[PDB]
Amino acid sequence: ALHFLDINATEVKKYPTAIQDIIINRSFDGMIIRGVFPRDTMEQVARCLEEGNDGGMKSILNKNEEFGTKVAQIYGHAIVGQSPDLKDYFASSAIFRQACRTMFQGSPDFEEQVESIFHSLSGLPVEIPTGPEGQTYTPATIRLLLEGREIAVHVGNDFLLMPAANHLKTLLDLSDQLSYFIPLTVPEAGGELVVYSLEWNPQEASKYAQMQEYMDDVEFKIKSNQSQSVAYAPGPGDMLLFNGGRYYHRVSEVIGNSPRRTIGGFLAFSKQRDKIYYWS
Ligand SMILES: O=C(O)CCC(=O)C(=O)O
Ligand SMILES: [Cl-]
Ligand SMILES: [Fe+2]
């Protein structure tokens, strides 16, 4: 059984060990934090993307057409699936940070507001990681799901098995990463985050040839309702923060003409749990 807290952003300082409780204690699995950003700010940013006065965000839009017409588009490169050098990732990350700061117009600033939230929920400093040669990681990416598009089932801790994670693994604790995201725009129907009770299990995955054959068996448990699940659909400006590192999750197919737009990434403890890093 998955357990998600629901509070308004005004209350976050009353939960100073929430991130510790999700990752280490595992007394619960996620939170909906209502109104981290005002509705007007979300609309403003959405309009920037739609009109094109987006601080150069459209210059780093990846349509992902090579992976079919059934997948999310993404502004900025997400680190998952990148080459170990991260050269393209770092280039797009710098642009993403610029454009994001421009669009939010400090009302409130995206990075400041998100860092404020994570700080309140942990009592710890919060930082965007720096690359081997001083490059900035991106704090977030924006995912765009048009009508009929979805995000296939996956689990966050698989990132640790990817070459792209080489550098981050020198900075992060061994524990679970969390996912965080905030809708900019929400669809008419569908586009729900579905989290399953099925957990990350590298011992079972290692007893297969490739990940496609293992994921087929994971898919069979999901399609047969063997695993318990909960669906979430946070509103614009609400943050959804959960143990995506541990639990398999997906975003259901978008229904209607109105696209689902979400800004977010991941977070995890530093080696000594004296700091939180966040990135996408
Ligand atoms: O809906 C999103 O923006 C991303 C969903 C997801 O897989 C995650 O938050 O880790
Ligand atoms: Cl994930
Ligand atoms: Fe995810």
Side-chain angles (χ1 to χ4, degrees):
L2 296 160
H3 301 122
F4 277 52
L5 312 187
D6 205 329
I7 65 168
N8 200 95
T10 53
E11 311 303 283
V12 294
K13 294 186 176 300
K14 300 173 185 179
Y15 300 87
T17 64
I19 291 173
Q20 289 87 341
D21 290 345
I22 298 164
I23 293 173
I24 304 167
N25 311 354
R26 307 191 60 240
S27 59
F28 58 101
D29 308 301
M31 310 168 61
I32 323 306
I33 305 159
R34 306 294 183 175
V36 171
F37 295 93
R39 293 295 300 263
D40 292 13
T41 307
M42 300 292 88
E43 290 171 35
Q44 166 185 106
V45 172
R47 282 197 306 281
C48 286
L49 288 170
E50 290 166 18
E51 295 169 334
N53 55 314
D54 59 11
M57 195 61 88
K58 63 176 173 290
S59 68
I60 61 173
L61 176 57
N62 302 298
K63 289 178 164 60
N64 296 140
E65 297 184 343
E66 72 271 24
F67 301 105
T69 321
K70 200 78 186 292
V71 70
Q73 301 179 225
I74 189 166
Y75 295 90
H77 289 301
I79 191 161
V80 158
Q82 296 292 123
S83 64
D85 61 74
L86 301 169
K87 199 181 173 201
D88 290 331
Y89 171 76
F90 287 138
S92 72
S93 294
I95 294 165
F96 185 96
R97 288 189 68 193
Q98 187 184 333
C100 191
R101 194 164 337 299
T102 303
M103 286 190 291
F104 276 79
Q105 301 201 251
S107 311
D109 180 65
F110 174 76
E111 292 177 11
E112 290 185 354
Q113 187 67 353
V114 168
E115 288 168 27
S116 183
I117 294 295
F118 297 157
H119 173 66
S120 296
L121 295 177
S122 65
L124 298 172
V126 185
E127 205 176 358
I128 300 162
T130 303
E133 320 307 323
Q135 308 97 325
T136 190
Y137 279 66
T138 191
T141 49
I142 298 168
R143 304 101 198 187
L144 173 65
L145 279 173
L146 302 177
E147 189 170 30
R149 309 294 195 81
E150 69 189 75
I151 299 176
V153 67
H154 61 284
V155 67
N157 281 176
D158 277 346
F159 177 55
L160 301 173
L161 310 179
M162 300 173 186
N166 284 347
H167 181 65
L168 272 182
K169 285 196 287 195
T170 65
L171 304 179
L172 298 179
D173 187 36
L174 302 165
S175 51
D176 302 330
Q177 66 170 62
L178 304 188
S179 289
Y180 84 95
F181 69 86
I182 303 97
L184 298 169
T185 65
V186 291
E188 293 156 38
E192 300 176 311
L193 181 81
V194 184
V195 186
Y196 297 88
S197 188
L198 211 303
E199 295 184 18
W200 184 60
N201 196 332
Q203 295 181 357
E204 298 280 44
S206 61
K207 299 153 64 182
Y208 276 80
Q210 61 265 33
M211 289 297 296
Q212 283 83 62
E213 295 187 323
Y214 170 67
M215 284 293 293
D216 293 336
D217 289 293
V218 172
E219 283 281 3
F220 275 117
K221 291 203 179 73
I222 292 159
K223 288 200 294 296
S224 62
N225 298 341
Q226 284 171 231
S227 176
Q228 292 179 322
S229 73
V230 187
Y232 297 97
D238 300 343
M239 183 190 285
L240 178 38
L241 175 70
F242 74 106
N243 199 344
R246 178 74 70 168
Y247 297 110
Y248 280 90
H249 55 284
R250 70 190 183 86
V251 180
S252 63
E253 186 184 339
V254 169
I255 309 302
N257 191 207
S258 293
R260 183 180 179 272
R261 295 183 185 80
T262 49
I263 182 164
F266 316 99
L267 58 155
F269 289 121
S270 63
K271 287 285 180 196
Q272 213 64 27
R273 294 173 182 170
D274 61 349
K275 182 153 87 296
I276 288 173
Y277 286 111
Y278 78 115
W279 74 97
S280 183

